[PDB]
Structure 1
């Protein structure tokens, strides 16, 4: 499978919410680019033939490994949505 699906299910009330969180994190990682990650310093995905898993081979694994750590928060309404949603599309 993928690293720690059991604790990923444990830290969320429903699997569908986990899917929404991981996919939204992946979309952010794409459209921002991979700069705003919380796993930059040492713990990063390791590619086989080179270190190609530095930049962008597959972002779902990035989002999952990023959510495995405790630097992420998710909720129904945690931040004023209007400002960030208007800054999401107009930049």
Structure 2
């Protein structure tokens, strides 16, 4: 089972909203190359390679953990799409 799935279901009125939030956040992370993360260097998800510990490539895991932290704000009509995208591209270029 996914870690803290019950608590994640707790944060939303509908599971599907959780899914949408996670997916979209994952899209943000992928688009901006993880440099917009709310996580701390010790909170970063890790993956064991032959070399050793590396950053987890999976953005969904990242998004779910980030959501579990509470530092993310989700809802409807929080901000116009264009303004959001441009401010994100200003804070975290591509």
TM over 0.5: yes
SS of the aligned residue for 1:54 comes to strand
Count of residue pairs the alignment pairs up: 91
Change (3 A) 1:52 1:10: farther
Post-superposition Cα deviations, 1:25-75, rounded to whole Å, max 9, x if no partner, equal 000000111101011331111222368774452111011011001110111
Q: TM-score, normalised by structure 1?
A: 0.81
Please identify runs of 4+ aligned residues in structure 1 that moved more than 2 A: 48-56, 80-91
- Segments of structure 2 that go 5 or more residues without pairing to the other structure are none
- Segments of structure 1 that go 5 or more residues without pairing to the other structure are none
Which structure shows the bigger proportion of residues in strand conformation?
2
CA RMSD, 1 decimal: 2.8
Q: TM-score, normalised by structure 2?
A: 0.79
After superposition, residues 1-91 of structure 1 pair within 5 angstroms as 1-49=1-49, 54-85=54-85
CA contact (8 A) 1:12 1:18 kept: yes
In 2: Cα distance, 1:80 partner to 1:73 partner:
15
CA contact (8 A) 2:8 2:68 kept: yes
